[PDB]
Structures are given as structure tokens and as C-alpha cells.
Design a protein around this nucleic acid. Structure first.
Lengths: 144, 145, 145, 69, 35, 48, 49, 49, 337
RNA sequence: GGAGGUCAACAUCAAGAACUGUGGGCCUUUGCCUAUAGAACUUAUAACGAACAUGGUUCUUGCCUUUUACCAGAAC
């Protein structure tokens, strides 16, 4: 439901605003702790909901953007996804990324009527060279 | 009488001209070389005795224009000759208009100390209560019986 | 750009330089003109001349009245001319609605999350909680009367 | 030294001064041109505006009934 | 209301008639351009 | 979406309101307050 | 292409220019029940006529 | 560039150089480009210093 | 001197008609601090306000045409051109902003006051705005090039109110140091002072015919003739003040708004005060919030528009029954001022 | 007298699809009707430049601790 959507986005707005300069791994660790709570409570449902996936992509981009400006840069070439996703041990932030995906985009007009079913995807986040990244939702068994 | 016609078209004239001289100055002062687009022998000295001509000298456009201009600060004598007689037209009133002295729980800007009481209902209940508690009471004792 | 830099290297910076109201320095201004515009009225209810000390001290009554209004203190000054007290209540109502009105407007700027600054958030939580409590105590009192 | 002002600055004090000649931006020419005008249902136990103010308004009490919650 | 009572139209106003863009003063082009 | 949703048909619309209204009654406004705005109501019949 | 917020496939993309399309009544006129889907209506039509 | 003209300024007609080359203080000649490149480096430099 | 008093028991002035309350328009969220009405079509107010909007109302119906927002702090004043299709409004954030009506947008920002600006007026034949406020000087803005051509130096205090007129004395202004100057522009200096009033001079107006100017004061409302800077009359007014405003008319009615919440109408010629009115304050208001912060008369002379600290406009109508039938007011016993 | 100039000054260049002069008749100078003469330059997938930059103000967004500096659409 939309209430709990805007709560989620409320939260992430909260990490961002509420951190004076919190270093990095603290930020990321807050990210994980939040998101995991969400994907963990609503397991199945998140599949269906467009705007939530939208918010995921945004939010996560926004956090990485934090660590980035933490230096000075948005430049994408400086921060290949290794930097953000290698586990703490190897010296990365270890943030657990389920932004990526590809996001079902089908023809809004009718999707205000029929439920037209997925015909297309819109690239959620990106890379430069790609590889891919595994996403949480796939490691959590669904409620049913 | 409100003042005619070929009067207001005079005062209007001599003013409007005077303003155009002002504006045209201040445009042709400054440094937009392109604000200027928006717009005499003059000495008989002594009796003119020697005649004269008054010739502006073209600058060197690089050098500052207005060699003497600057931003300084002056104070002026407000000097006048004439006076302006100001000509206008404590018993019951000081009752009314006496104002106490401020003593504020919050600020104490000098540190002053003050007798506390400068720092520091009538109605009863509504019988809504009386009825409430006694009704609860009655139903109560009915029930217990 | 450079044209300026060099007229300032010759002719010095300007002394007056007014400035403008703006985002940051707003309230101070709003305040400042409010106070001035009490001091007219209260200077003209007084019979004659007596001003300076009477004035300042009456403004101290202003602030004290406001910060009472916030804390919801009923604020009765022991003895003081009725009309004056009228004026203070009039204004402080005005400032009150400036405040509450801005509290709504901003909250509904945050709920969208559209470029509200940092402190603006924390502040606006202040203005809210205050307002919420006032509603509270009201609701109780009327639950008495 | 924080003091409530008692005054304001006469424009005249300014007026005596000599100019500068700095050029602002907002003074650059714009709009050079003027314009002139010409059965079951019985079972249960229960048997058959604008107020000049704010905090007493109906809106405001809705609002505070949402947000501060 | 009765505060004034009878002659007095007490009318509270919000929104707009004359939607914002609408010119509030008519412009004047004397000639009729058909082009 | 419109299809998946509940369609508005005078009969069912008026079941919804009907029921809700009945239950508006059963509790006095002294304890609580139950506003339409808060409720939602869903019906199941031939059309929906 | 701009003014309608469309994109010729090889074309330059721009901003909406009339951004609020999202306001809509729930209104029967152009509904699905009452329309025939026979040929899809690609963009280039919408830019062509 | 094509959707939004500018529509230039009759009266621009008073160029800088025309105004400048009219005075006592400027003079005119010819000279190899590269050279004038260099003179402009000396110039620009002495100014900023 | 008794001569003077015998004469005043003769002329026995000019019967005028009562007034009453036709309409109340709410809709602002602050105090309502100025009103100004079309010099042409009389279809519309424009109303200053303390929430910094400026709403344009419709004269006949009372509906709301539009809102012109676009100021940060409260708007003190408005004026509408005759010749030009413009609207200058001025506020306390120190800014005098032209408007243009045809599009309903701002156009030119005049600039340079040191501090808040309480009054504008629009000279009739020259294309000049005049403005002034707490700085204590009156600037004369040229309109198209935005330069403040001339600055009238002057009083020793905030300037409450400025008026423009076509011949000499061109600009006339009154100021909390209790004068009223009569200005000669080009000369650049004062042509005359009228010192009588006793404390701040808070309002003025120009007789739309007679070529003279009513100057209020706190509690005593004089008139003055221009050209000479005479005295002319002295309106019989006990202390009803504080006078926020005056409005003269085409029929020689005079209006004066009190802050005690009392409308006080006069004859102009005389001084005779022929009606008073408590202005029913409002629904939930606070007795202090009955007051009157502005006034003006439409172009016909028959309708009155005022704002009031209780966030509302009221429009007053001139009741036609009148004549003498049982009209008469307070009945003319001129007293020793 | 002819040709030229990386010479100068003074005019004019965006509109009822559109310029100017003159004669005759009417209202009473404007203006209207009619007659007549000449019309460089610029225009119909519309325009002085088969080219293409910046700034201001006012709004909507995007960066998002704040101001310069900015993101991309619109109006003037």
C-alpha cells in the first residue's frame, strides 16, 4: 500500500538528511538495515508494485551519490560497482544492492484499466561495462 | 480653482525637460558603452573681455574616465536662514497612561534580581459529572445485587 | 565583470550599499518593522510626549506577550491602560497567523519533499508540536466547561 | 551589544555622498518601451462557519489531526 | 450572517474566476490581422 | 486499475453505504468517531 | 516531436512542455469496452497527421 | 537553435573598433599572425601582473 | 474675534445623505492594508494585504477575479495608472515593483530604498512614480529607465503618505514628525511647511476638484489649500482618533476611518460631522481587531470600500431615502477650537 | 569622367501581406472616397546571418546542508 511506500522513502530521506558527515560504512550499513527490513517484511508483494521499484532505484542512487560527493564527484567512471558492493572485508562498503533489476514499464494508459501485463523493461540502474549483480529478493523465501 | 489647462501644460513642460536632462546624464555617464544609445562658446568671462572657446579634449579611451571620481563620504551642513514656527493649539490622564515595569520569566538581560511575585479559574464542575458517577454507581449496585 | 573589478580598484567600494531582503535575513526584518509599527500606535495613544523609557519598556511587554502566546500562558499584566493592551493583543494576533500559516505551508512542502532546506525541517517540527499542544489543552478545557 | 534600534538610517546621509560607477546587472536595459492606454439488525445494545481565528478553525484542526497525529 | 443580517451579502471567497492567465486588462490591436 | 478495481453500480454502491451506515449507528460518538472518509467498503455480487 | 513529448525513433528527445497529463477523470468516452484495436497507432502516425 | 530566435538589434551599428580606431592613440599596421599571437601573450601577461 | 463665531452660525451647510453596509467580502488571510480601484472601468478593486498577496476583486458581483502574488513581506500600498496600463505595488521588503496588467506579471523593479516603503503615487502627466517610507526621503523614480532621478531630502521621520499633483506644489507628503511639506521638484526643495498638527500625520487625500488636501492627524482633521498653503477649514472632531485614513469625494463628502472602529463622515466645506458608525467587527474576532486600515471611493462617488484588521473588506452604500425626510444628522453647533 | 577601397559619416531594414508622393471630391488638420506616378533592400517549408552565443526577471523541475556555479522546459 502507498502509505508504507511513502514511509520507506521517508526513512531513506531520513538517513540522508540526518547524517552530518557520518563517514561511509555507517551510511551503507544504515541502508542495508533499512532495506532488509522492507524486503523482509513484504517479501512477495514487492514484485508487483511499480512506484516502489521506482523509489528503490532513486533512493539507492541517492546514497551512492552521498558517498560520492563525500569526496568530490558524481563521475561514474571513478566508481565502478566494485567500490560499493565488495564486502567490508575486501574494503568495500558492502552495501546490499537490490536497485538494479529491470523495471516493467508497460504503456501506462491502458494499465490504468486492463492490467496489460509486462511488455517492456526500463533499465533501473546501470554500469559502464555491465556484469550484473544479484539482488536480495532472490535470496529471501516468499511467505506462501 | 483647480488650475486651468495651459497652465498644467506648462509646469508639465519645464519639468519633463528637466528630467530628460537628468536621465540623459546618468545614462551617458556609465560604462555600458551602449547605454548612451538610449537617450557652446558658453564663456563670456569677465565681460568676455578676451573672447574664448571652450573645447572638450577627447580622452584616451583606455584610461579611466573621470580621473577625479571616487567613492568618498561627506557630511553636509544643514544650513538654513529662516525658522518655521511650529504652531500648535497631567491631572486625570496619568491615572490612565501609567505603564508598569517589565519583569519577564525568560530573559534577564542585565542580571537584575527581583521580588519573586513579579516573576511568580473561578467556575466549578458541571453536573454532567455528578450524574455520570452516580448513574454508573446505581447500575453498579443493581448489577452486584 | 572586469569593468567592475577595475573601477573598484580605482574608485573604492561604495559606502552606502543598501541591501535587500532575502531568504536568510527575512525574519529579522519582519520583526523589525513590526516593532516599529507598534511604536507608532502606542506613541499616539499616550497623551503627549513621554516616550523613550515608556516606549522601550512597552516593547519589552510585546516580546513578553509573544513568548507567552507561544507557551500558552494566558498573560494578564497587573495594571496597565486598556487601550495599550488592546494594541498588543491586536499585533500579536497578527504575528500569530503569520506563524501558524507558515507552519502549514512548509509542512506541505516537506510532505512532497520538494527542496526544503535542512533546518527548515527541524524548525517546522517545533512550530507543529507547539500548535498540537495548544489544541490539546483547548480540547480539555472545553471538555470541562 | 544587541540592541533594538530606536531609529533608521536617513536616506539623506547616503544622498550627500559621491557616486561610485559600478555597473549592476539588473540595471541593464530591459523593456525600453512604454505602453500607453487608449430480525438481526435489532440485536445490538443501541435501540432506536468561518471563525476568524486559526486554532479554533475546522481546517487547522483537520491538519493537526493528520500530521502531528 | 445576522451579524449584518439582511441587506448584507456575506460572501466568503476562494479559488478564482477569470483564470490566472486571462488578461485582466484587454489588449488593443486596432487593425484586424487575418494572416 | 478500473477493471481490477470495484465498479460502481447503484445497487452495490448502496449496499456499501447501507451496511456502513447501520454500523455508524451501533457505536455512540461519545466513545469514538467513525467517519465515512476513513472507511472503505467492498462488495461481491454478479457485477463486481 | 517535442511539443507532443514524442520521439522519432532516431530522433532528439526533449522535455514534456505540457507536463501535467496525469489529471484525468474516470470517464467513459474513449474507454476500452467501446473501442476497436485493429492496427496499433505507432508514434510516427502522431507526428505525421 | 531553430525553435527560439534572437532577432538582432538594429543600431548595434557602433562597433568597438570603429570607435577606437578613430582616436589619436591607436594606429594601424600589418604584421605576421604568429607574431601578433606573441604580442598578445606579452600583453595579457603584463596586465594580469 | 467673536465676529468669527457669529459668522459660523449662519451658513448652515450642505445636506448630504447617510451611508450603510451593503456587502462584506472575506478571503484574505491577513490584515488588509490598501485598496486601489480602476481609474477607468470601475470593475475591480486591487487589494493589498498582510499575507503578501494582492487579490483583484470584482466591483459589481463581489467575486474574486484573480490573485497577483509575488511579494515576500507585507504589501503596504498599491496604485493604478490612468495612462498606462500598469500597476505599481510596493511592500516592506523594500521593493517597488511595477506590474503589467495585460499579462498579469511583473515587469520592472525600481530599487534603492534603504528600508521599508510605505507609500507610492503616480504623477498624472509625467510618467513618474513617486515613493517613500522609513528612510525619510521621497524618491522620484523615472518609469522606463528605473533611475531615481531625484531625491527629495527632507523631513526628520518616517514618511507616511505621498501625493502627486499636476501643477506646482507637485508632491506633498506627511511624516511622523508632524508636518506636511509642499514640494517644488525642480528646485529640489521645500516650498512650504504646514506645521500645525500635533503628532504624526497619518493620512491625506486630494480633493478631486477643489484643489486642496485634507490632512488628517491623530485627532484633528484639517484641510489646507494649495497654491498658498493656506489653512482653510478645521473639521469638528472630538478625539475620535487615531485616524488611519481619509477619502474625499466628488460630492464633497469626506470619509475618515478610526481605529476605535468608527466611521466618521463629514461635509467637506464645513466641518460638520453628519454620521458615525460602529463597524460590526466580525464572527470570532478580538475587540481590538475592529479598525479600518484603508478607504477609497469608486469613480462614481457613490460606493465605499474599506479594509479592516479582521481580514475583510466591507463595501458601504449611500442610502437614497434621505432628503430631509427624517434624514438629519448631528445638527450644526459650531464650537470653540 | 571611369574603375576600385577589409575607407568614413548620415539615413533605413519585419508589416491589414504590409512602401511613398501627387491630383480631385467630402467631413473639418487628422481622416474618408476616388484618380495618378514611382517603387532600392528583406521575406512563404516565411526573412536582415541557406549562420548561432550569453545575460536578466518570473514561473515549473533536477542536482540537494546554504550562496556563487549549475541541471532542462516555458513566458516576457
Amino acid at each position: 500500500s502507498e502509505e508504507e511506500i511513502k514511509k520507506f522513502d521517508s526513512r531513506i530521506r531520513g538517513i540522508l538528511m540526518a547524517s552530518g558527515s557520518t563517514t561511509f560504512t555507517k551510511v551503507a550499513a544504515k541502508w542495508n538495515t533499512s532495506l532488509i527490513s522492507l524486503f523482509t517484511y513484504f517479501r512477495e508483494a514487492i514484485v508487483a508494485t511499480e512506484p516502489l521499484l521506482d523509489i528503490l532505484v532513486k533512493g539507492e542512487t541517492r546514497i551512492q551519490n552521498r558517498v560520492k560527493l563525500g569526496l568530490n564527484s558524481k563521475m561514474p567512471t571513478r566508481f565502478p560497482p566494485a567500490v560499493f558492493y565488495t564486502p567490508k572485508e575486501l574494503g568495500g562498503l558492502g552495501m546490499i544492492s537490490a536497485s538494479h533489476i529491470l523495471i516493467p514499464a508497460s504503456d501506462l494508459s491502458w494499465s490504468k484499466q486492463t492490467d496489460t501485463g509486462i511488455t517492456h523493461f526500463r533499465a533501473g540502474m546501470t554500469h559502464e561495462d555491465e556484469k550484473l549483480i544479484p539482488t536480495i529478493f532472490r535470496y529471501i523465501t516468499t511467505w506462501e | 480653482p483647480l488650475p486651468t489647462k495651459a497652465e498644467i501644460q506648462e509646469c508639465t513642460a519645464r519639468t519633463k525637460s528637466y528630467i530628460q536632462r537628468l536621465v540623459n546624464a546618468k545614462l551617458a555617464n556609465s560604462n555600458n558603452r551602449a547605454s548612451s544609445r538610449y537617450v557652446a562658446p558658453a564663456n563670456l568671462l569677465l565681460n568676455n573681455s578676451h573672447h574664448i572657446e571652450v573645447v572638450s579634449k577627447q580622452m584616451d579611451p583606455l584610461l579611466p574616465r573621470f580621473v577625479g571620481k571616487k567613492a568618498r563620504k561627506v557630511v553636509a551642513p544643514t544650513e538654513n536662514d529662516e525658522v518655521v514656527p511650529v504652531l500648535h493649539m497631567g491631572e486625570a490622564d496619568p491615572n490612565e497612561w501609567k505603564i508598569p515595569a517589565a519583569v519577564s520569566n525568560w530573559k534577564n538581560p542585565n542580571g537584575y534580581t527581583v521580588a519573586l511575585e513579579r516573576r511568580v479559574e473561578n467556575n466549578t464542575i458541571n453536573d454532567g459529572f455528578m450524574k455520570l458517577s452516580e448513574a454508573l454507581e446505581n447500575a453498579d449496585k443493581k448489577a452486584r445485587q | 565583470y572586469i569593468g567592475n573589478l577595475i573601477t573598484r580598484q580605482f574608485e573604492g567600494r561604495s559606502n552606502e550599499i543598501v541591501k535587500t531582503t532575502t531568504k536568510q535575513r527575512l525574519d529579522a526584518y519582519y520583526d523589525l518593522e513590526l516593532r516599529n509599527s507598534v511604536m507608532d500606535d502606542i506613541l499616539e495613544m499616550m497623551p503627549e510626549s513621554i516616550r523613550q523609557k515608556k516606549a522601550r519598556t512597552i516593547l519589552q511587554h510585546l516580546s513578553e506577550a509573544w513568548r507567552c502566546w507561544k507557551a500558552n500562558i494566558p498573560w494578564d499584566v497587573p495594571g496597565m491602560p486598556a487601550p495599550i493592551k488592546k494594541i498588543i493583543e491586536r499585533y500579536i494576533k497578527s504575528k500569530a497567523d503569520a506563524w501558524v500559516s507558515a507552519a502549514h505551508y512548509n509542512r506541505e512542502r516537506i510532505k512532497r519533499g520538494a527542496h526544503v532546506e535542512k533546518t527548515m525541517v527541524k524548525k517546522n517540527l517545533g512550530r507543529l508540536t507547539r500548535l498540537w499542544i495548544k489544541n490539546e489543552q483547548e480540547r480539555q478545557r472545553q471538555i470541562q466547561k | 551589544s544587541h540592541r533594538p534600534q530606536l531609529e533608521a538610517r536617513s536616506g539623506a546621509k547616503a544622498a550627500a555622498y559621491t557616486p561610485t560607477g559600478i555597473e549592476h546587472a539588473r540595471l541593464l536595459p530591459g523593456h525600453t518601451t512604454l505602453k500607453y492606454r487608449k430480525s438481526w439488525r435489532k440485536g445490538t445494545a443501541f435501540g432506536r462557519g468561518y471563525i476568524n481565528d486559526m486554532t479554533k478553525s475546522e481546517y487547522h484542526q483537520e491538519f493537526l489531526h493528520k500530521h502531528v497525529r | 450572517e445576522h451579524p449584518y443580517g439582511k441587506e448584507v451579502e456575506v460572501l466568503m471567497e476562494t479559488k478564482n474566476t477569470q483564470s490566472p492567465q486571462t488578461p485582466l486588462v484587454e489588449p488593443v490591436t486596432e487593425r484586424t490581422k487575418l494572416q | 486499475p478500473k477493471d481490477s478495481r470495484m465498479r460502481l453500480i447503484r445497487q452495490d454502491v448502496n449496499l456499501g453505504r447501507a451496511v456502513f451506515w447501520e454500523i455508524q449507528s451501533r457505536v455512540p460518538t461519545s466513545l469514538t468517531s467513525i467517519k465515512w472518509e476513513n472507511a472503505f467498503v467492498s462488495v461481491y455480487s454478479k457485477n463486481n | 516531436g517535442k511539443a507532443l513529448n514524442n520521439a522519432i525513433p532516431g530522433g532528439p528527445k526533449f522535455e514534456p512542455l505540457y507536463p501535467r497529463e496525469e489529471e484525468e477523470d474516470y470517464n467513459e468516452f474513449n474507454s476500452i469496452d467501446r473501442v476497436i484495436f485493429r492496427v496499433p497507432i505507432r508514434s510516427e502516425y502522431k507526428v505525421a497527421f | 537553435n531553430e525553435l527560439h530566435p534572437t532577432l538582432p538589434t538594429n543600431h548595434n551599428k557602433t562597433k568597438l573598433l570603429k570607435s577606437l580606431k578613430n582616436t589619436k592613440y591607436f594606429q594601424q599596421t600589418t604584421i605576421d599572425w604568429v607574431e601578433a599571437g606573441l604580442q598578445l601573450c606579452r600583453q595579457g601577461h603584463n596586465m594580469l601582473n | 474675534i467673536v465676529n468669527r463665531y457669529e459668522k459660523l452660525l449662519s451658513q448652515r451647510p450642505e445636506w448630504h445623505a447617510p451611508w450603510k453596509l451593503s456587502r462584506v467580502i472575506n478571503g484574505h488571510l491577513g490584515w488588509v492594508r490598501c485598496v486601489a480601484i480602476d481609474p477607468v472601468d470601475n470593475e475591480w478593486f486591487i487589494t493589498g494585504s498582510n499575507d503578501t498577496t494582492m487579490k483583484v476583486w470584482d466591483l459589481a458581483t463581489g467575486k474574486l477575479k484573480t490573485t497577483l502574488a509575488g511579494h515576500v513581506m507585507t504589501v503596504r500600498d498599491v496604485a493604478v495608472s490612468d495612462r498606462h496600463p500598469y500597476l505599481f505595488s510596493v511592500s516592506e521588503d523594500k521593493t517597488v515593483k511595477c506590474w503589467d496588467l495585460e499579462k498579469n506579471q511583473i515587469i520592472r523593479d525600481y530599487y534603492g530604498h534603504l528600508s521599508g516603503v510605505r507609500t507610492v503615487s503616480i504623477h498624472p502627466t509625467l510618467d513618474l512614480i513617486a515613493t517613500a517610507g522609513r528612510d525619510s526621503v521621497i524618491k522620484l523614480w523615472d518609469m522606463r529607465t528605473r533611475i531615481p532621478v531625484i531625491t527629495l531630502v527632507g523631513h526628520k521621520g518616517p514618511i507616511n503618505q505621498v501625493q502627486c499633483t499636476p501643477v506646482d506644489p507637485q508632491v506633498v507628503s506627511s511624516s511622523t514628525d508632524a508636518t506636511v511639506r509642499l514640494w517644488d521638484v525642480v528646485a529640489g526643495k521645500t516650498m512650504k511647511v504646514l506645521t500645525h498638527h500635533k503628532r504624526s500625520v497619518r493620512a491625506t487625500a486630494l480633493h478631486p476638484k477643489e484643489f486642496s488636501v485634507a490632512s488628517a492627524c491623530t485627532d484633528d482633521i484639517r484641510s489646507w489649500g494649495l497654491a498658498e498653503g493656506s489653512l482653510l477649514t478645521n473639521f469638528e472632531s472630538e478625539k475620535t482618533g487615531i485616524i488611519n485614513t481619509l477619502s474625499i469625494n466628488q460630492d464633497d463628502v469626506l470619509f475618515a476611518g478610526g481605529d476605535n472602529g468608527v466611521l466618521s463622515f463629514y461635509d467637506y466645506k464645513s466641518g460638520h460631522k453628519y454620521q458615525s458608525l460602529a463597524t460590526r467587527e466580525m464572527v470570532g474576532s478580538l475587540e481590538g481587531e475592529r479598525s479600518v486600515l484603508c478607504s477609497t471611493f469608486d469613480k462614481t462617488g457613490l460606493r465605499l470600500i474599506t479594509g479592516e484588521a479582521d481580514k475583510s473588506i466591507k463595501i458601504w452604500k449611500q442610502d437614497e431615502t434621505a432628503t430631509k425626510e427624517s434624514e438629519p444628522g448631528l445638527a450644526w453647533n459650531p464650537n470653540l477650537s
